[PDB]
């Protein structure tokens, strides 16, 4: 069997809470009044949701309404409970209300509104300083949710709303998030392919908050190198091949050995042998204004195979890459 692992930070938060904090299946929802809201304009569609700008007609407040398609109530309560436990944290999207149609019983979550920039416009315009600023703002949200015993598990550009005109950022889409219980084996079929950590790709189930830090590093590399996504796999096996062609195979097999991880023999066959490629090799004329020695050192400390060796979000906030933002 694989060697067990525990988070280096916030390991025991959930045992320092009443059971109902994390036992989301017992949660009793506080339902508001759907008649308080009217739709204004559609913003987007999810696999299980339709997302609208809306207005509270009792007090003129602009909000966003996320109408939920039929999924298991268990998943809905998990997302509600997590949003209520994290409400108020820095750059965490704020849940304002929870309503349901009395006839069709379709539920909806009501949130503060964000005027999100086209991520195409967004990439053209961000400077080096901007990337550092927004990265620090994401770290504030991740440190906060990790400190409250939750892993997001789906960190990626589509789930980071940036209103660049208002220099405003929110981490959204808490539908994959989960409570961290040390020793628990989690489903590895989470995150989007390009942002999946090596632990997911080798089926190492005793992962923790540090999964989100791998995803964050994938976002940082795509932004500073102007290559989206940075690790562009065709499937979950190719995804680890793409990672191994940058980080190298030597460290991958050291990680597998350290945790007594068993790979499919054919997976081992396709991984081959790849030298580590220095981060400087990804710098080009078109992206060099976003790259600095500090950025590459920071990236190198996020994108590590061994989840225990990655910076925590709190450690990341201390990195010299952020000195120009905070001091």
């Amino acid at each position: 069997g694989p060697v067990p692992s525990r988070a280096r930070v916030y390991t025991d938060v959930n045992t320092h809470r009443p059971r109902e904090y994390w036992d989301y299946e017992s949660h009793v929802v506080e339902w508001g009044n759907q008649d308080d809201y009217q739709l204004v304009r559609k913003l987007g569609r999810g696999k299980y949701s339709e997302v609208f700008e809306a207005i509270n007609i009792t007090n003129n407040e602009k909000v966003v309404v996320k109408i939920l398609k039929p999924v298991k109530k268990k998943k809905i309560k998990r997302e509600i409970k997590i949003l209520e436990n994290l409400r108020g944290g820095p750059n965490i999207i704020t849940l304002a209300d929870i309503v349901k149609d009395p006839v069709s019983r379709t539920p909806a979550l009501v949130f503060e509104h964000v005027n999100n920039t086209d991520f195409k416009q967004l990439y053209q315009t961000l400077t080096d300083y901007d990337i550092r600023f927004y990265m620090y703002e994401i770290l504030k949200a991740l440190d906060y949710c990790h400190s409250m015993g939750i892993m997001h598990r789906d960190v990626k550009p589509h789930n980071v709303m940036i209103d660049h005109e208002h220099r405003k950022l929110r981490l959204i889409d808490w539908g994959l998030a989960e409570f961290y219980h040390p020793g628990q084996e989690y489903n590895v079929r989470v995150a989007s392919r390009y942002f999946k950590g090596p632990e997911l790709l080798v089926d190492y189930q005793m992962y923790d908050y540090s999964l989100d830090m791998w995803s964050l590093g994938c976002m940082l590399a795509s932004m500073i190198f102007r290559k989206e996504p940075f690790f562009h796999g065709h499937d979950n096996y190719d995804q680890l091949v793409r990672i191994a062609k940058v980080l190298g195979t030597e460290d991958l097999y050291d990680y597998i050995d350290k945790y007594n991880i068993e790979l499919d023999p054919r997976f081992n066959d396709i991984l081959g042998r790849h030298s580590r490629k220095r981060w400087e090799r990804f710098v080009h004329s078109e992206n060099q204004h976003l790259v600095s020695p500090e950025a590459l050192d920071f990236l190198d400390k996020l994108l590590r195979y061994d989840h225990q060796s990655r910076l925590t979000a709190r450690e990341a906030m201390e990195h010299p890459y952020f000195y120009t933002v905070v001091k």
Binding site: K47, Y48, D154, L176, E178, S192, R193
Partner: peptide
């Protein structure tokens, strides 16, 4: 959304 839930 490449994935959906936890188990």
């Amino acid at each position: 959304x490449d994935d959906d839930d936890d188990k």
